[PDB]
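Form 12-C: Joint structure prediction
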Amino acid sequence: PTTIEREFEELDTQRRWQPLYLEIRNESHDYPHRVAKFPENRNRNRYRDVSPYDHSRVKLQNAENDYINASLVDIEEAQRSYILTQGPLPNTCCHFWLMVWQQKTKAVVMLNRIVEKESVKCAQYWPTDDQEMLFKETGFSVKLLSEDVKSYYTVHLLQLENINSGETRTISHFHYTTWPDFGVPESPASFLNFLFKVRESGSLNPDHGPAVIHGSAGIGRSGTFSLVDTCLVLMEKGDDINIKQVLLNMRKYRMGLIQTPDQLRFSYMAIIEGAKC
Amino acid sequence: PTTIEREFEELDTQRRWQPLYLEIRNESHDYPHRVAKFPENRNRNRYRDVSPYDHSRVKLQNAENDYINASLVDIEEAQRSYILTQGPLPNTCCHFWLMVWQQKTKAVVMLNRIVEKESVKCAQYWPTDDQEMLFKETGFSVKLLSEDVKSYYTVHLLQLENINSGETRTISHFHYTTWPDFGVPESPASFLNFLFKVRESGSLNPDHGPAVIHGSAGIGRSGTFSLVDTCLVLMEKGDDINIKQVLLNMRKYRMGLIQTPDQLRFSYMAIIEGAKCIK
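Section 2 - Result
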């Protein structure tokens, strides 16, 4: 904890955050992602520059087209596993809830707004009122159980139902509402508080399926969330951590996590402050 | 402006907001609201103790059932007209948009959140994304054009289309997001700023149909919003104002406007500060 604060201060005074982030870009390797570019998958992708690698993509089980824009990002050293996905499209919200069910997910972490700078970045895939939301394509319904609104985030409790079996599960929907795309949270403090609420629910624990983390692309803010959570686990287990090394290993699972130098710098501060807790 | 400032300070120091609000209750008259209680209309009312008066209710034209829980609130001395309405129910959002169309409304002012204290207070009657919302019972579709999110309110630009005529209109939807039910806005400043944005759009001006103001019941926050706007209009025209008499007059058009003493106190404060800002 003392060492990463020393490193951050070196990068600040010498103003080397952009060269550092550019060095991580160059050391990130490309892996095959041929399935994302199948013709019949082009309406399942939000962005043409954001595809899951063939070796780590989440597959819809027992589906004729198993493809969803989702990556299982796994860190064995930390016992941490997350699914990072794009903001679902109107036609993939059914696949998204099918994924949440098959993986036994307990929480969805949403870091984006439905509309950002006059572009819809995500479909309304949960209901805002008491009307049930139906996904006939995959046989799931979503109903709103509870809503707790705060100034920079909201938590929803949703009832996800498998209409075919009648079975039901409660999904915690943690929605960060003041985090701009390609930008940073307002405060490391506000961010850390949000992370700790997601942790306190147990939704990141190994006795559950991987949590679903998404923004609009599931890359920038989503990578920052997972990078900070993971490196708080590693320090907590007593491990010495190289953040650049942790982030490079994570990028083997999904391309281009952490999208700006500022996002990388913010990840350092949040890791340093979260350690003091 | 100095006189209402004297009055506020007297009521604040002597803590007399409740004797005042109770005295206004007693000077408020009840008028028939029999149509709201017709058997076919009771699934169109959110709350059974919240009804529009027969003499000021907005009528849905060219419909088999003309009823909607909405009141035309008029202050002729201010050249101001509002429609105060409940938060529409799932089966009445088609009626709400038919009313917006027929009344040539340009803005909807929304003062509630969809869920407050774990209770649904209003149906999702506009779309949050790029999927179009359809109301086939009345032949209208709503599409989201634009969204500007600010710290205490959001503005949505919506395209309201009459599907059978194909004609289209742009509705300004001003959604104040930080005003709890039976409560008060966080800061007079943020509220006053929000009101001033609604005015800047011209949606309250005489060359448009009346704006639609709603909360969940369309009475407490809706009444606070309308009282403050009206009394700033009356002051800038140079009229001497008894706010209590303006509120009693507004209550002839819809029952129980402004629901708490703190809301009544907040109307005074916003009026006093909005005047000093205008000057």
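Section 3 - Comments
DSSP finds seven helices and eleven strands in chain A. Residues 1-277 of chain A form one domain.
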